Design an enzyme around this catalytic site. Structure first.
Site, PDB file in Angstrom:
ATOM      1  N   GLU A 195       0.193   3.623   1.570  1.00  0.00           N
ATOM      2  CA  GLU A 195       0.145   4.046   2.960  1.00  0.00           C
ATOM      3  C   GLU A 195       1.508   3.839   3.625  1.00  0.00           C
ATOM      4  OE1 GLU A 195      -2.863   5.267   3.335  1.00  0.00           O
ATOM      5  OE2 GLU A 195      -2.483   6.100   5.330  1.00  0.00           O
TER       6      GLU A 195
ATOM      7  N   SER B 172       0.780  -1.228   0.000  1.00  0.00           N
ATOM      8  CA  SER B 172       0.000   0.000   0.000  1.00  0.00           C
ATOM      9  C   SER B 172       0.817   1.286   0.000  1.00  0.00           C
ATOM     10  CB  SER B 172      -0.928   0.003   1.216  1.00  0.00           C
ATOM     11  OG  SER B 172      -1.549   1.265   1.390  1.00  0.00           O
TER      12      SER B 172
ATOM     13  N   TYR C 162      -1.353   0.264  10.927  1.00  0.00           N
ATOM     14  CA  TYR C 162      -1.637  -0.438   9.681  1.00  0.00           C
ATOM     15  C   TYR C 162      -0.476  -0.267   8.702  1.00  0.00           C
ATOM     16  CZ  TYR C 162      -3.315  -1.056   4.877  1.00  0.00           C
ATOM     17  OH  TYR C 162      -3.432  -1.435   3.559  1.00  0.00           O
TER      18      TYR C 162
HETATM   19  N1  LIG Z   1      -8.064  -0.621  -1.309  1.00  0.00           N
HETATM   20  C1  LIG Z   1      -7.038   0.227  -1.364  1.00  0.00           C
HETATM   21  O1  LIG Z   1      -7.197   1.374  -1.799  1.00  0.00           O
HETATM   22  C2  LIG Z   1      -5.856  -0.276  -0.953  1.00  0.00           C
HETATM   23  C3  LIG Z   1      -5.835  -1.377  -0.213  1.00  0.00           C
HETATM   24  N2  LIG Z   1      -4.724  -2.146  -0.075  1.00  0.00           N
HETATM   25  C4  LIG Z   1      -4.763  -3.485   0.526  1.00  0.00           C
HETATM   26  O2  LIG Z   1      -5.105  -4.411  -0.484  1.00  0.00           O
HETATM   27  C5  LIG Z   1      -5.938  -5.459   0.086  1.00  0.00           C
HETATM   28  C6  LIG Z   1      -7.308  -5.422  -0.548  1.00  0.00           C
HETATM   29  O3  LIG Z   1      -7.938  -4.170  -0.296  1.00  0.00           O
HETATM   30  P1  LIG Z   1      -9.441  -4.084  -0.110  1.00  0.00           P
HETATM   31  O4  LIG Z   1     -10.143  -5.101  -0.991  1.00  0.00           O
HETATM   32  O5  LIG Z   1      -9.945  -2.683  -0.411  1.00  0.00           O
HETATM   33  O6  LIG Z   1      -9.784  -4.425   1.441  1.00  0.00           O
HETATM   34  P2  LIG Z   1     -11.110  -4.894   2.249  1.00  0.00           P
HETATM   35  O7  LIG Z   1     -11.074  -4.327   3.615  1.00  0.00           O
HETATM   36  O8  LIG Z   1     -12.290  -4.626   1.381  1.00  0.00           O
HETATM   37  O9  LIG Z   1     -10.981  -6.475   2.332  1.00  0.00           O
HETATM   38  C7  LIG Z   1     -10.158  -7.112   3.310  1.00  0.00           C
HETATM   39  C8  LIG Z   1     -10.264  -8.607   3.148  1.00  0.00           C
HETATM   40  O10 LIG Z   1      -9.410  -9.271   4.132  1.00  0.00           O
HETATM   41  C9  LIG Z   1     -10.192 -10.206   4.856  1.00  0.00           C
HETATM   42  N3  LIG Z   1      -9.595 -10.401   6.178  1.00  0.00           N
HETATM   43  C10 LIG Z   1      -9.427  -9.479   7.180  1.00  0.00           C
HETATM   44  N4  LIG Z   1      -8.913  -9.978   8.277  1.00  0.00           N
HETATM   45  C11 LIG Z   1      -8.726 -11.320   7.977  1.00  0.00           C
HETATM   46  C12 LIG Z   1      -8.194 -12.395   8.719  1.00  0.00           C
HETATM   47  N5  LIG Z   1      -7.745 -12.284   9.974  1.00  0.00           N
HETATM   48  N6  LIG Z   1      -8.138 -13.604   8.117  1.00  0.00           N
HETATM   49  C13 LIG Z   1      -8.593 -13.717   6.863  1.00  0.00           C
HETATM   50  N7  LIG Z   1      -9.114 -12.783   6.068  1.00  0.00           N
HETATM   51  C14 LIG Z   1      -9.150 -11.595   6.690  1.00  0.00           C
HETATM   52  C15 LIG Z   1     -11.561  -9.537   4.875  1.00  0.00           C
HETATM   53  O11 LIG Z   1     -12.564 -10.425   5.323  1.00  0.00           O
HETATM   54  P3  LIG Z   1     -13.865  -9.928   5.871  1.00  0.00           P
HETATM   55  O12 LIG Z   1     -14.863  -9.650   4.762  1.00  0.00           O
HETATM   56  O13 LIG Z   1     -14.431 -11.009   6.774  1.00  0.00           O
HETATM   57  O14 LIG Z   1     -13.666  -8.660   6.679  1.00  0.00           O
HETATM   58  C16 LIG Z   1     -11.665  -9.158   3.406  1.00  0.00           C
HETATM   59  O15 LIG Z   1     -11.855 -10.328   2.621  1.00  0.00           O
HETATM   60  C17 LIG Z   1      -5.923  -5.223   1.592  1.00  0.00           C
HETATM   61  O16 LIG Z   1      -4.825  -5.914   2.172  1.00  0.00           O
HETATM   62  C18 LIG Z   1      -5.723  -3.716   1.689  1.00  0.00           C
HETATM   63  O17 LIG Z   1      -5.116  -3.347   2.910  1.00  0.00           O
HETATM   64  C19 LIG Z   1      -3.525  -1.601  -0.476  1.00  0.00           C
HETATM   65  C20 LIG Z   1      -3.529  -0.456  -1.217  1.00  0.00           C
HETATM   66  C21 LIG Z   1      -4.721   0.125  -1.565  1.00  0.00           C
HETATM   67  C1  LIG Z   2      -4.032   2.854  -0.080  1.00  0.00           C
HETATM   68  C2  LIG Z   2      -4.879   2.725   1.174  1.00  0.00           C
HETATM   69  O1  LIG Z   2      -6.168   3.317   0.887  1.00  0.00           O
HETATM   70  C3  LIG Z   2      -7.004   3.383   2.052  1.00  0.00           C
HETATM   71  O2  LIG Z   2      -6.403   4.169   3.082  1.00  0.00           O
HETATM   72  P1  LIG Z   2      -6.798   5.626   3.282  1.00  0.00           P
HETATM   73  O3  LIG Z   2      -6.598   6.039   4.732  1.00  0.00           O
HETATM   74  O4  LIG Z   2      -5.990   6.528   2.358  1.00  0.00           O
HETATM   75  O5  LIG Z   2      -8.386   5.756   2.927  1.00  0.00           O
HETATM   76  P2  LIG Z   2      -9.662   6.576   3.526  1.00  0.00           P
HETATM   77  O6  LIG Z   2     -10.664   6.693   2.436  1.00  0.00           O
HETATM   78  O7  LIG Z   2     -10.068   5.960   4.820  1.00  0.00           O
HETATM   79  O8  LIG Z   2      -9.124   8.039   3.873  1.00  0.00           O
HETATM   80  C4  LIG Z   2      -8.479   8.838   2.884  1.00  0.00           C
HETATM   81  C5  LIG Z   2      -8.202  10.226   3.420  1.00  0.00           C
HETATM   82  O9  LIG Z   2      -9.467  10.937   3.607  1.00  0.00           O
HETATM   83  C6  LIG Z   2      -9.575  11.337   4.959  1.00  0.00           C
HETATM   84  N1  LIG Z   2     -10.986  11.388   5.333  1.00  0.00           N
HETATM   85  C7  LIG Z   2     -11.710  12.538   5.554  1.00  0.00           C
HETATM   86  N2  LIG Z   2     -12.849  12.324   6.156  1.00  0.00           N
HETATM   87  C8  LIG Z   2     -12.889  10.949   6.337  1.00  0.00           C
HETATM   88  C9  LIG Z   2     -13.891  10.129   6.924  1.00  0.00           C
HETATM   89  O10 LIG Z   2     -14.970  10.469   7.424  1.00  0.00           O
HETATM   90  N3  LIG Z   2     -13.535   8.785   6.891  1.00  0.00           N
HETATM   91  C10 LIG Z   2     -12.370   8.290   6.359  1.00  0.00           C
HETATM   92  N4  LIG Z   2     -12.220   6.957   6.412  1.00  0.00           N
HETATM   93  N5  LIG Z   2     -11.425   9.043   5.813  1.00  0.00           N
HETATM   94  C11 LIG Z   2     -11.748  10.354   5.834  1.00  0.00           C
HETATM   95  C12 LIG Z   2      -8.690  10.369   5.731  1.00  0.00           C
HETATM   96  O11 LIG Z   2      -8.331  10.954   6.964  1.00  0.00           O
HETATM   97  C13 LIG Z   2      -7.505  10.287   4.779  1.00  0.00           C
HETATM   98  O12 LIG Z   2      -6.769  11.499   4.879  1.00  0.00           O
HETATM   99  C14 LIG Z   2      -7.286   1.966   2.583  1.00  0.00           C
HETATM  100  O13 LIG Z   2      -8.011   1.231   1.609  1.00  0.00           O
HETATM  101  C15 LIG Z   2      -5.971   1.241   2.883  1.00  0.00           C
HETATM  102  O14 LIG Z   2      -6.242  -0.106   3.243  1.00  0.00           O
HETATM  103  C16 LIG Z   2      -5.072   1.274   1.643  1.00  0.00           C
HETATM  104  O15 LIG Z   2      -3.818   0.682   1.939  1.00  0.00           O
END
Ligand SMILES: NC(=O)C1=CN([C@@H]2O[C@H](COP(=O)(O)OP(=O)(O)OC[C@H]3O[C@@H](n4cnc5c(N)ncnc54)[C@H](OP(=O)(O)O)[C@@H]3O)[C@@H](O)[C@H]2O)C=CC1
Ligand SMILES: C[C@H]1O[C@H](OP(=O)(O)OP(=O)(O)OC[C@H]2O[C@@H](n3cnc4c(=O)[nH]c(N)nc43)[C@H](O)[C@@H]2O)[C@@H](O)[C@@H](O)[C@@H]1O
Ligand SMILES: NC(=O)C1=CN([C@@H]2O[C@H](COP(=O)(O)OP(=O)(O)OC[C@H]3O[C@@H](n4cnc5c(N)ncnc54)[C@H](OP(=O)(O)O)[C@@H]3O)[C@@H](O)[C@H]2O)C=CC1
Ligand SMILES: NC(=O)C1=CN([C@@H]2O[C@H](COP(=O)(O)OP(=O)(O)OC[C@H]3O[C@@H](n4cnc5c(N)ncnc54)[C@H](OP(=O)(O)O)[C@@H]3O)[C@@H](O)[C@H]2O)C=CC1
Ligand SMILES: NC(=O)C1=CN([C@@H]2O[C@H](COP(=O)(O)OP(=O)(O)OC[C@H]3O[C@@H](n4cnc5c(N)ncnc54)[C@H](OP(=O)(O)O)[C@@H]3O)[C@@H](O)[C@H]2O)C=CC1
Ligand SMILES: C[C@H]1O[C@H](OP(=O)(O)OP(=O)(O)OC[C@H]2O[C@@H](n3cnc4c(=O)[nH]c(N)nc43)[C@H](O)[C@@H]2O)[C@@H](O)[C@@H](O)[C@@H]1O
Ligand SMILES: C[C@H]1O[C@H](OP(=O)(O)OP(=O)(O)OC[C@H]2O[C@@H](n3cnc4c(=O)[nH]c(N)nc43)[C@H](O)[C@@H]2O)[C@@H](O)[C@@H](O)[C@@H]1O
Lengths: 313, 336, 334, 333
Positions: free
Chosen positions: B132, B130, B153
Site C-alpha cells: 500500500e 505494505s 494508512y
Molecule cells: N494483510 C495484508 O494483506 C497486509 C497487511 N499488512 C499489515 O500487516 C499486519 C498484519 O496484517 P493483518 O493480520 O491482516 O491485520 P489485522 O487487521 O487482521 O490485525 C491487526 C492487529 O493489530 C492489532 N492492533 C490494532 N490496533 C492496535 C493497538 N493500538 N495496539 C495494539 N494492537 C493493535 C489488532 O488487534 P485487535 O484484534 O484488537 O483489533 C490485531 O491484532 C498489519 O500491520 C497490516 O497493516 C501489510 C501488508 C499486507
Molecule cells: C496490502 C494491504 O492489503 C489490504 O489493503 P487493501 O486496500 O488493498 O484491501 P481491500 O481488500 O480492503 O481492498 C482491495 C481493493 O478492492 C477494492 N474493493 C472493492 N469493493 C470493496 C469493498 O466492498 N470493500 C473493500 N474493503 N474493498 C473493496 C478496494 O477499494 C481496493 O481497491 C489491507 O490488508 C492492508 O492493511 C494491507 O497493507
C-alpha cells in the site's frame, strides 16, 4: 426526532441504552472502535435508526467530526477500558481513555455548541469504584478514595464533567452507577463468568468452574441515565439497588435454577453500600428487576447459548 | 529456547505466524488489546491447546505498556504486526491510525532500543510493511520502487518503514521491513474485499443472503496466502544482515476476476447478486499492485506455495462450511 | 552521593529546589522541554562543574521519561512539571490534563517499571496543589475534600490519586505535597503576584502607566517558594510516605497585595489599576487558607518568610529589575 | 482583510512570516505554547492590533480546531515543530507526535472546518530538505526520500499526509520543501547560529573555545527572510503543489567557519575543538537543492547569498556580544 450519540455502544450498557432510546423514538448514533474481529456482537440483532461510526476516545478529531455531522441532542459517554484488574496492566492507556478521553468528548461538545449555537445534554458514566475505600453509606457527595488507576481516572472524568457544568453551564450529568450485570455482561466479570459455566456444565460441554456487591440489571440502569438528562437542571446521581448479595448466594440461585448443586462443580481458587435516595426521589427511578430475576435471566440466556454450542458439536 | 514477541497477534498474520513459530519450537508472546468483547477468535485453539504461548495486555499508543512487556519477556525476535489495517477506515480515523501505524511503530522500535542498551541484550526486529506504500506508483513494484501513498494508512506505513530503516542505519538494530502485498486466508478480516466476498458467497449458496454490495471491481491486486507469507517474515530475521524485502506472488488480478473464480467455483453468476454502492469507493484509490519478489526468492529462497485459484477456492470452501454451520443453527431454530 | 531527578526544573520551584538539593550535596538531574527559545532563565546561574545535568524529555512522552530514569538511576524523583496556569487550563484542557494528570501517571509507572526491572529503590514526590480543594471552605487540611474549579485543578486531583494509588498498591514511597500558593522573584509573570510587582516596579520608574487585573476579591495563602522546596525534601526523608499540606495558614486578598506592594513605594494602586473581564476565570476559587499542623508536627517545617516580607521581597527585586531596564532603554540597549 | 493562522509563530520562520504578512495587510493569528518563561522573544517587537496570539499545541487536536473555528482563517501555515535533528534522536516519540501526527491533526482540523462551515482554506506545510536524507544531490521535488533521523522521517510522513489530503479531498495544500535557512533569529543550537554566536563572544573575550561535531557535512544555506516569501507565493497560485526552496549552492560547515571567522580576522582552528557528542547517529552528508520549479512557477529567487548571510549573522551576534560584555562589566548579568 431526538438524536442521541453513544460512545461505547458495543458494550453492555451501550447495547441496552440503544434499545431503550430506540423504543423512545430516538435516532441513535454510536461510535465504535475498528478491530480485526467482529465486535458488534451485542448490537448485531439491532443493526439488522441506528448508525455506527468509527472513532476513538484517544482521537479528539474523530470525536468532534461525528458530533458535527450528527448534531446530537444527547451525548452518552459510556466508552472506557472498564476492567479494574487490567487498569493496573495498562494504566497510561486507561487514563487516556477514561480520564482524558472524557475531557476530549466534553471539550468537543462545548466547542460544537459554541460554534453552531446548539444545545447538548451530556451524560458521564461514573462508577462506584470512585468511592474506593471510603466507608458507607456512599452518596453523591461522599469523598473519593480510588483504589486503582481505572477508579482514579473515573474520578478525574467525574470532576472534568462537574467542572464543565459549573464553568460553562453545560447540561452535564454524572451517573454514579454501582455494579450492573446482564446476559451481555463481559465474560471477564464474576457474574457472567459463573452463568457462562453453568450453561456449559448443564449442556455437558464443561466439567469444572473456577468482597460483596450491589448488583443491578443493566436494563434498569440505562433508563436512569436517560431520566437524568430529562430533568430541568443537570445533576449527579447515585444509581444502585442498595442491597447486597454474595457470589455463593449467586451460585445457589443460578445452579439451583437449573436443578444442579453448586457443590458438584464449584472449584475454589470491596465494601460498597450506595444510597440511591436522590435517584428515587428526583428521577423517580426504581429497579424493576430484582437480584433473583437478574440471575435466572442470565442463566436462561447462557443455557440457550450452551445449547447452540451442543447442537454445533 | 527462542522467544518471540508478536504485536497484533490476534490478527490474521499474527495467528498464522504464531502457529509457524510454535512449529519451530519458539516460545511465543503476544500483546493484545482489552476489548468489551471476545477478541482472540483466531488464536483460541492455540491458547487452549500459560506455557509456550502467553498473551499480555498492551496498546501501541501506550509506550509504557510496550517497554514493560519487553523487559519482562526479554524476546529474541519482535514482530510488529499491530495496526489499524483497513485503508477505508483510515480516511475516517486518520489521527488514531497514524498514532498506531506510524508513531506506534516508533514507540516499539524505541522501546526495543532502550531495552537492548539498558540490559545489553540483542533483539531482531520485523516491521509489517505494505504494498500500500507504493500507492499510485506503477507496477511491478520492488524494494526500489518509490512510494506515493494514497491514504492516511499508507502514508503512516511509509513513516513506520522509514522509522525502522532509520533505527537500523543509526543504531545497528537488526530491523527488517517486510514489504508484503495483499495476502488473504480463511481468517481474513470480513471487511476486506476477498473475505467479504467469500463470506457473502457462502451465505448465498445456502440461502442466507441474496445481495452483495461492493465498490470498485476494476482494482487489481497481487493476492497471496497469509500462511505462506508469515514464513517469509521469519526467514528475513534468520539472514546474516537486516534488509527489506518485497513478498508477493507477482501475479495480479482484479476484484472482478475474484468474483468470477469464487462464484463460478460454486456454479453461480455473481452478476446476479452483486450490486455497487459508492460508499465503498475510497477518496483516493490504489489502482494496480503487483510485486516483484525477485530479491526474496534469491536471498530468502522464499516462494509462495499457494496460487491464486487455490487461495480463492480455499477461502470459498472454508466460508461455505461456515455458512452451512450457520444454516444448521437457523434450521434447528437456534439462530434467528 | 544522592541523585535527584527533577521534572519541571526550569520552573520557579524547580530552580529553588535545585539550589537547595545542591547545597545538600546532591547530584541533580532535570528534564527540560526543547524550545525554539532560551528556556533556562531561572537556572542558568546555577552553573556559576556538573552536579546539575539537564536532559530533553516531555511528560507526554513516556519513553523519554523511562529513558533518563534508566540512565540516571535516581534515588529521589520530584514531579514538578506541569502546565501550571489555571486560566490557561480552561483554554487548553486536553493538553493540560495530559501533562498534569496522565503525565504524572506516566512518570509514576516509569519509576515503578524501573524499580522492578533493576531492583533499585526510588522515593517519589508529587507536586500537589491547594487548587484541588477548589470551592471547599477554609482552612483546608489533608483531610479536606476536593472540589476542583478548573481542568488544571481536576487534573491535579487525578495526579494526587494516581500517586496515592501507587503508594498503596505497590508500596512505592510516594508523597503528595499539597502546597498552597507560593511566590518569589522568579514567579511566572502571568500569575497575579508577579504580574503586580513587575508592573509596580515599572510604573515606579515611568516605564508603565496602567495595570490591568481581574478579581481582586480572591483570597489566598501566599508563601515563599524558597521555603516550600525544603518541605518537599523533608517529606521524602521521613520513614514512611504520606501527604502534607504546606502553607503559612494566613490568607490575604489580591487587593491587600495591591495595598502592601504599591504603598511600600508610596503609591496608590487605585491610580493605575483597571479591571478587565478577560482576566476572570470561568469558575473561580474564592478562599484558600491552609492548615499545616501536620507539616510542623511531623516534618518540623515552618515558613520563615511572612506575607509582608514576601511582598516587599518581590517588589524590591522587580523594582531593581525595572530600574536596570530603564537604564538599558535610556542607553539605547533595549 | 485576509486572515492567516500560523502555527510555530514564535520560531524563526514564524517571526519573519508574521512581519511579511502584516506588511501585506493581513490579520495574523499565531498559536503559541504556554511556558514557564517568556517565549515570545522573536515577535515581541510586533505584538498594533493585527497580530493575535492564542494558546494551543500540535499534540492537542481540540486546541487546533478550536482556534480555527473562532478565527476562520483564509490561510494556514504549519511551521510548528520540534525542529532539531539531534534532539529528535533523544525524544523520537514526542518529535513524531508533533512533526508527523501533529501535521495530520491540523490538516484534519482544517478539513473538518471547511466541511462543517463550507469555507475555503489554503494550507502550507513546512517540509524540509532533511526528508531527502542520504539521497545524493541535486535534490528536487521528486527526489526520493531516505530520512536519516526521526525528525526527517516524521517530516516525510507530514509531507505525504499533506499530499494525500490534496489528492483525496482536493484541499489546497502545498508542501514547501525548504532547505536550510538561517538568520540572526536562528536557534542557537543550530550550527550556523551556534558558530556566529560563539564567534562574537570570542571576539569580545567572553568565550575562548567553540565545540562542534562533523565539519564536513555540506548544506545549502539561505536567509529565512527570503524563504517565508516563497511560502506565501505557493498559496497565491491557482493550483496547489510542492516546491523546493533553496539557493542551489552547497557549502560545508568548515567553509562556514572560514568565512565567519575570517570575516573578523580570526583563525577558527585556534578556537574550535571536535566533540564526539555533537555527531548524529546517522548523518546527512550533502544537500543542494534544485529550485527551478519555484523560480519558474513562483518567480521566486533568493536575494541573500551565502557569504552575505554569514556576514549578516556575524554582524548581529558581534554587536550582541559587545553589548553583553558591557552588561557583564556592569553587574547586570
Ligand atoms: N494483510 C495484508 O494483506 C497486509 C497487511 N499488512 C499489515 O500487516 C499486519 C498484519 O496484517 P493483518 O493480520 O491482516 O491485520 P489485522 O487487521 O487482521 O490485525 C491487526 C492487529 O493489530 C492489532 N492492533 C490494532 N490496533 C492496535 C493497538 N493500538 N495496539 C495494539 N494492537 C493493535 C489488532 O488487534 P485487535 O484484534 O484488537 O483489533 C490485531 O491484532 C498489519 O500491520 C497490516 O497493516 C501489510 C501488508 C499486507
Ligand atoms: C496490502 C494491504 O492489503 C489490504 O489493503 P487493501 O486496500 O488493498 O484491501 P481491500 O481488500 O480492503 O481492498 C482491495 C481493493 O478492492 C477494492 N474493493 C472493492 N469493493 C470493496 C469493498 O466492498 N470493500 C473493500 N474493503 N474493498 C473493496 C478496494 O477499494 C481496493 O481497491 C489491507 O490488508 C492492508 O492493511 C494491507 O497493507
Ligand atoms: N458495568 C458496571 O457495572 C459498571 C460500569 N460502569 C462504566 O459504565 C460504562 C459502561 O459499562 P459497560 O457497558 O459494562 O462496559 P464494557 O466494557 O462492556 O464496554 C466498554 C465500551 O467502551 C468502548 N471503548 C473502550 N475503549 C474505547 C476507546 N478507546 N474509544 C472508544 N470506545 C472505547 C468499548 O469498545 P470495544 O468493544 O471495542 O472494547 C465498549 O463499547 C463504562 O464506562 C464502565 O466503566 C460504571 C459502573 C459500573
Ligand atoms: N507555585 C505554586 O504556587 C503552586 C504550584 N504548584 C505546582 O508545583 C509545580 C511547580 O510550580 P511552579 O514552579 O511554580 O510552576 P512553573 O509553571 O513555573 O513551572 C512548570 C514547569 O513544568 C515544565 N513543564 C510543563 N509542561 C511540561 C511538559 N509537557 N513536559 C515537561 N515539562 C513540562 C515547565 O517547562 P517549561 O519551562 O518548558 O514551560 C516548567 O519547568 C507545578 O506542578 C505547579 O502546578 C503547586 C502548588 C502551588
Ligand atoms: N529552519 C530551517 O532551516 C528549516 C526548518 N524547517 C521547518 O520549518 C519550520 C520553521 O523552522 P524554524 O522557524 O527554524 O523552527 P523553530 O524551532 O525556530 O520554531 C519551531 C516553532 O514550533 C513551535 N512548536 C514546537 N513544538 C510545538 C508544539 N508541540 N505545539 C505547538 N507549537 C510547537 C515552537 O514553539 P516554542 O517557541 O514553544 O518552542 C516554535 O514556535 C519548522 O517546522 C522546521 O522544522 C524546514 C526546513 C528548513
Ligand atoms: C496554588 C496554585 O497557585 C497558582 O494558581 P492561582 O490561580 O491560585 O494563582 P494566580 O496568581 O493566577 O491567581 C490568584 C488569584 O488572583 C486572581 N487574579 C486577579 N486578577 C488576575 C490576573 O490578572 N491574573 C491572574 N493570574 N490572576 C488574577 C485569580 O483569578 C485568582 O483568584 C498556580 O501556581 C497553580 O499552578 C497553583 O496550583
Ligand atoms: C533543513 C533542516 O535544517 C536544520 O537541520 P540541520 O540538522 O541541517 O541543522 P544544524 O545546523 O543543526 O546542522 C547542520 C549540519 O552541521 C552539523 N554540525 C556540526 N557541528 C554541529 C553542532 O555542534 N551542532 C549542530 N546543531 N550541528 C552541527 C550537523 O551534524 C549537520 O550535518 C533544521 O532547521 C531542520 O529543522 C530543518 O528541517
Amino acid at each position: 426526532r431526538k438524536i442521541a450519540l453513544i460512545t461505547g455502544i458495543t458494550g453492555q450498557d451501550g447495547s441496552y441504552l440503544t434499545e431503550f432510546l430506540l423504543g423512545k423514538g430516538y435516532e441513535v448514533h454510536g461510535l465504535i472502535r475498528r478491530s480485526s474481529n467482529f465486535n458488534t456482537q451485542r448490537i448485531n440483532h439491532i443493526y439488522i435508526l441506528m448508525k455506527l461510526h468509527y472513532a476513538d476516545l484517544t482521537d479528539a478529531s474523530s470525536l468532534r467530526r461525528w458530533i458535527d455531522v450528527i448534531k446530537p441532542d444527547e451525548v452518552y459517554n459510556l466508552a472506557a477500558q472498564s476492567h479494574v484488574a487490567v487498569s493496573f496492566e495498562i494504566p497510561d492507556y486507561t487514563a487516556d481513555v477514561v480520564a482524558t478521553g472524557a475531557l476530549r468528548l466534553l471539550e468537543a461538545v462545548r466547542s460544537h455548541t459554541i460554534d453552531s449555537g446548539r444545545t447538548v445534554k451530556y451524560y458521564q458514566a461514573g462508577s462506584s469504584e470512585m468511592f474506593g475505600s471510603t466507608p458507607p453509606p456512599q452518596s453523591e457527595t461522599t469523598p473519593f478514595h480510588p483504589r486503582s488507576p481505572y477508579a482514579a481516572s473515573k474520578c478525574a472524568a467525574h470532576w472534568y464533567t462537574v467542572n464543565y457544568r459549573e464553568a460553562y453551564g453545560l447540561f452535564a450529568c454524572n451517573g454514579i452507577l454501582f455494579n450492573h450485570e446482564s446476559p451481555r455482561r463481559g465474560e471477564n466479570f464474576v457474574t457472567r463468568k459463573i452463568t457462562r459455566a453453568l450453561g456449559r456444565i448443564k449442556v455437558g460441554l464443561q466439567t469444572k468452574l473456577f468482597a460483596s456487591r450491589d448488583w443491578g440489571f443493566a436494563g434498569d440502569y440505562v433508563e436512569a441515565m436517560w431520566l437524568m438528562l430529562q430533568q430541568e437542571k443537570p445533576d449527579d446521581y447515585v444509581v444502585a439497588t442498595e442491597e447486597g448479595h454474595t457470589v455463593e448466594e449467586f451460585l445457589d440461585v443460578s445452579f439451583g435454577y437449573l436443578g444442579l448443586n453448586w457443590k458438584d462443580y464449584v472449584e475454589i481458587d470491596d465494601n460498597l453500600q450506595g444510597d440511591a435516595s436522590k435517584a428515587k426521589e428526583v428521577l423517580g427511578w426504581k429497579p424493576q428487576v430484582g437480584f433473583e430475576k437478574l440471575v435466572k435471566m442470565m442463566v436462561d440466556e447462557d443455557l440457550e447459548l450452551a445449547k447452540r454450542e451442543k447442537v454445533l458439536v
